[PDB]
Design a binder for these strands. Sequence first.
RNA 1: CGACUCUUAGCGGUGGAUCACUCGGCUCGUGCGUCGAUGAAGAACGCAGCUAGCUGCGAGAAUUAAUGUGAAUUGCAGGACACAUUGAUCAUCGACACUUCGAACGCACUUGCGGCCCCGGGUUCCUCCCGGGGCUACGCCUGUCUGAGCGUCGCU
RNA 2: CGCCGCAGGUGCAGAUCUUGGUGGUAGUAGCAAAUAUUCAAACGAGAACUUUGAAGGCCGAAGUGGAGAAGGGUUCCAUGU
RNA 3: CAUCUAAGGCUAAAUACCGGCACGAGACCGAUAGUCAACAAGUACCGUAAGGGAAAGUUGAAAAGAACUUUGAAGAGAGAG
RNA 4: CGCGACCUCAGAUCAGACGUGGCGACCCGCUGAAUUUAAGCAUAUUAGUCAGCGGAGGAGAAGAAACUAACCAGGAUUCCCUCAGUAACGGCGAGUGAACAGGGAAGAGCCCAGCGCCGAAUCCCCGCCCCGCGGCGGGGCGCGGGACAUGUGGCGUACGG
Lengths: 86, 134, 50, 52, 135, 158, 122
Amino acid sequence: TKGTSSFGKRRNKTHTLCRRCGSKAYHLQKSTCGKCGYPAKRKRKYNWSAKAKRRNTTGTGRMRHLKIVYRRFRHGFREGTTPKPK
Amino acid sequence: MKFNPFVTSDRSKNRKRHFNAPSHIRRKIMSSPLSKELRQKYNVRSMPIRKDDEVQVVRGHYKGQQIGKVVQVYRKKYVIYIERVQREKANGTTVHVGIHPSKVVITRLKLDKDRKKILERKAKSRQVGKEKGK
Amino acid sequence: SSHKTFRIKRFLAKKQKQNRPIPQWIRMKTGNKIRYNSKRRHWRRTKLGL
Amino acid sequence: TWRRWHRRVNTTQKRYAICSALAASALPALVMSKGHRIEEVPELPLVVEDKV
Amino acid sequence: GRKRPVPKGATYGKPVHHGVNQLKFARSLQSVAEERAGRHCGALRVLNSYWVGEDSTYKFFEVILIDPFHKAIRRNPDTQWITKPVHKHREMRGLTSAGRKSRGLGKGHKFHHTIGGSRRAAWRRRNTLQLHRYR
Amino acid sequence: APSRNGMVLKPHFHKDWQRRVATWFNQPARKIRRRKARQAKARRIAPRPASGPIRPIVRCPTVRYHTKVRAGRGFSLEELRVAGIHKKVARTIGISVDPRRRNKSTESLQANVQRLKEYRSKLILFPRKPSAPKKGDSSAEELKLATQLTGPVMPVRN
Amino acid sequence: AKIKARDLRGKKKEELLKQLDDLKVELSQLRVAKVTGGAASKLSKIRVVRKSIARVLTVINQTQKENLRKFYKGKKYKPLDLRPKKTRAMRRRLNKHEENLKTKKQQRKERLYPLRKYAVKA
RNA sequence: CGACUCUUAGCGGUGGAUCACUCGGCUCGUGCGUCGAUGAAGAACGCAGCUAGCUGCGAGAAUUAAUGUGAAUUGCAGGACACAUUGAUCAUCGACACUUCGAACGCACUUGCGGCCCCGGGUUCCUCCCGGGGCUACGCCUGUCUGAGCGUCGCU
RNA sequence: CGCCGCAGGUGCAGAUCUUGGUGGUAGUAGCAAAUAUUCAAACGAGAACUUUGAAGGCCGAAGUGGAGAAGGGUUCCAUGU
RNA sequence: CAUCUAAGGCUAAAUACCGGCACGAGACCGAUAGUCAACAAGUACCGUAAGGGAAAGUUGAAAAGAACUUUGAAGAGAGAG
RNA sequence: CGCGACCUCAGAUCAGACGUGGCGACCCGCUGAAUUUAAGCAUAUUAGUCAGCGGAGGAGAAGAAACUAACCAGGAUUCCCUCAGUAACGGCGAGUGAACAGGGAAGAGCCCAGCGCCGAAUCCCCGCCCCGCGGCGGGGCGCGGGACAUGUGGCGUACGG
Ligand SMILES: [Mg+2]
Ligand SMILES: [Mg+2]
Ligand SMILES: [Mg+2]
Ligand SMILES: [Mg+2]
Ligand SMILES: [Mg+2]
Ligand SMILES: [Mg+2]
Ligand SMILES: [Mg+2]
Ligand SMILES: [Mg+2]
Ligand SMILES: [Mg+2]
Ligand SMILES: [Mg+2]
Ligand SMILES: [Mg+2]
Ligand SMILES: [Mg+2]
Ligand SMILES: [Mg+2]
Ligand SMILES: [Mg+2]
Ligand SMILES: [Mg+2]
Ligand SMILES: [Mg+2]
Ligand SMILES: [Mg+2]
Ligand SMILES: [Mg+2]
Ligand SMILES: [Mg+2]
Ligand SMILES: [Mg+2]
Ligand SMILES: [Mg+2]
Ligand SMILES: [Mg+2]
Ligand SMILES: [Mg+2]
Ligand SMILES: [Mg+2]
Ligand SMILES: [Mg+2]
Ligand SMILES: [Mg+2]
Ligand SMILES: [Mg+2]
Ligand SMILES: [Mg+2]
Ligand SMILES: [Mg+2]
Ligand SMILES: [Mg+2]
Ligand SMILES: [Mg+2]
Ligand SMILES: [Mg+2]
Ligand SMILES: [Mg+2]
Ligand SMILES: [Mg+2]
Ligand SMILES: [Mg+2]
Ligand SMILES: [Zn+2]
């Protein structure tokens, strides 16, 4: 029966964690993430969902490299030099 | 009034800088005036508060001429703790009462190499200022 | 189930370590504003994502 | 943001208002009615030397 | 020409858009050939191309590519322009000779659609409501 | 629905105009930025005219404006040839050159070359080597008489 | 009783590794005391020893890196981590030499018709 | 007489309106206008003496170094720290370091399995076992080497 | 905050209006599927419900038994509240 | 008769900027408002998934956050401070 | 009946480089509706717009006439004012709709192929030596390799040479 009886039979997972983007949208049977499209080189992203775009845009994560790039830009990306020793 | 276009007069911004100030500029914020004798001995008016210098409270409940030595500079609460400025709580112990450094005057300076250097620098800039405005 | 992968077990390990009360000394910190762990999870009440 | 915040006034009307404002600043009744405490001012069209 | 990619020729809409056959791509076959050469060799820059043959079902074009990082190119002026970052993938932006022919660029009464740089540049300038400070 | 007398109005507001509305709140800032760029450019070309090269005398095309005279793009090659200025040296000494404009009348040609002669007479030429003057100009004429001109060079009047 | 990188830099590689090894042994004993009760003194020494391990390793890595930079100084090809790390785009730029070399035609134009300094009288 | 019920008021509750406050937004303007195979964005997992979250960081893990500053940090504890045989904290940040996925790169993954060259150990150098290190993706340019062709030829 | 001007996101009983709170209903419906509990003692402030012992019963091996797959993810196990 | 010389190429300035870095300002809003988010907010939670998405500010100048006595098993009270 | 030269191809974990992916407010190239309006509706309108795909930079694109004009002629592009709700398009209905001249902001011009002359005058790579590290360059040397006469470089481009 379509209601409570059929709810007991759901025990096989369709989706799983995705090694890219870490979301539980990795369709096991299709081997494709429904949020990022992992086997594709390009990230899945659509302009009809601005709310979804800002959930996973740049700046919502850590920006381990970009925050150092912003710091280094203020001094012209200098390398090979040190402050004058005391 | 203020003419620098890169300095803000916004109240919300100014309070944000004050309450989120790093510790190394909280030291400058927590400055106290020197006594009249000290302002005569060195050509400086104020000085950042120090752990071991002696001050007297001029405002509040603990007003008086008692020269109490500072025992703590608690920069997070923007207060300092003084020797005899303390209160007896319920259980029987005594605890220090935080006092803002702007409400005390430093009677004796805890002097060392760094304090002398800052005192000379402040006095020199003041003498440059008076010789410009003369 | 008893049969599990290493990635799933590592995921459950983090959730186990994360599901614990806040320390008592946190309440005494300056400007705490934290009363209790708002992210506490019970196995029967709220199920994990996976 | 396109609320039409600004208005344009005719140059002749703007010059008119300056003439009226200057003329009123020479009548002690009008300046006193603004509340400017001109009681010991030696002369309401107060002119001082160029040294100032 | 370009057959519209709709299932079973069904273009759900008004009859003016029911066309499936007899439709034409906005860009020439030479521009398509340059695009496929540039996309395959993403490390090279398309310069131009020319016609070398055709039959009923195929057209053949030869595309001139330049390695922007070869020393013979970078040490030579009058060709250093191709090495600049603003010149990567000209064929995907219609900046080659073949690609540009489809944009309606030109001087005079026949090319008013692209005054401003492009069709979209003209369309914006004409459909933008200049709401001044003093109206 | 129309009501009594009035105009038949056709407002062009059927096309989602609110996404493309150009406000002008940056107009005073743009005037300041343009003005500062003019002052910086004038300082960069220190004794040269601030407006730029001298432009020729030009008659407006159509029958509505042919009674009016304005400033063109540059002096024609025919003007430079009969005024004795090389077309590659004119641009270095502050003379605009328009190679694609031709002369149809000797009246306009003679008026423009007389303009070029007057400019060449008014021109102070600093020597390329300040210590060694070759053929530029007398030291007296450039010691203090050399000042930055403002406005158009010999403005075109009617 | 602490360890300073200022006086560590005179030490050779052999005794630097010995000092690192003693710190690692000390930290392993401090972890033993942590799980077997220990004391507040030994618990607070865990961070001090960990910082000392980081200090010794930093001096070791800096000395080796600055020796390799001296070694590859003036050679045609360097390891990628020894090359500059300006920006990916900035590394693709034409160098200062080929941004400044000009054609013989351009050189002849400037030799013959150079921009002059002039003023116009009113 | 009380109970009950209704009205009004005092007091007490329930509730969080109002007002006052505001380290937040929104809007406008300005100067810049900088990511990535030298491994980005993003994700995962870890890192504190007592630490779950936020924050910060990467096995050197709530940070190393350097420079500026100049006596703290602090919830508790511990311990430094002559502040001149150099210095707590904070800030800056140019040295060093930077786990696993990810364009993601040996092959593959809801698992796991290789190959090549070196080094160390059991071996007591020959190749088996163990550990370590460096390599091993696709396309493409210039050059190199090795080649294929009853392709066009020359000598034979 | 008053007065002279200026500018509005400027006045609520309704919209099966939005959000929050609270009543009567109302100590009301109800806590009735699968036969069933009782005695004594212990701990304990407190026992119809915990534990132990004694009875009387039920599942009756296609079990209310002993183990697994999927799924859950620490629910496992001691101690304490 | 007039005008230009296509089917090759480069080029700064004036121009654009609801993403980013760093600032300044406002006749704007003032916690049901203003961004969804003034707070551990794209968080808690929901859905297999694409995706959906909150509520939640205020002791006091200073914790000086009620020592101690007393009833109760405690919650909770009466004094005191 | 093998050895060479060239041509066209192939392999390599060959030596040295380069591309991928992200953000995407602004910009460029395509693809591209319908709700809506027409008081119905099919052309039309919405709209070359939403959604979709690709490609960049601090700006992008455009750009130095196969131009405008018809005048006593102007003179690259881009932006602003105006032309102008106009000329024109349109079940000539609803509706849509530029350009020139004029005034300003800015203003800057140029390079090849081809025709020709010049003993390939040209370029890349690899070593050795010296001067320097800063976006890896200079100077010299090599009967050192390769590219190139199926055309490199200098002069020279309609303003003529
Ligand atoms: Mg169904
Ligand atoms: Mg299935
Ligand atoms: Mg359940
Ligand atoms: Mg239609
Ligand atoms: Mg040439
Ligand atoms: Mg009452
Ligand atoms: Mg009440
Ligand atoms: Mg340090
Ligand atoms: Mg398997
Ligand atoms: Mg053969
Ligand atoms: Mg209202
Ligand atoms: Mg109301
Ligand atoms: Mg109401
Ligand atoms: Mg009403
Ligand atoms: Mg009942
Ligand atoms: Mg019952
Ligand atoms: Mg039975
Ligand atoms: Mg069973
Ligand atoms: Mg149990
Ligand atoms: Mg809100
Ligand atoms: Mg309120
Ligand atoms: Mg209770
Ligand atoms: Mg290789
Ligand atoms: Mg209709
Ligand atoms: Mg209708
Ligand atoms: Mg209809
Ligand atoms: Mg779109
Ligand atoms: Mg790309
Ligand atoms: Mg460009
Ligand atoms: Mg162009
Ligand atoms: Mg031309
Ligand atoms: Mg009109
Ligand atoms: Mg249209
Ligand atoms: Mg101008
Ligand atoms: Mg030639
Ligand atoms: Zn995914």
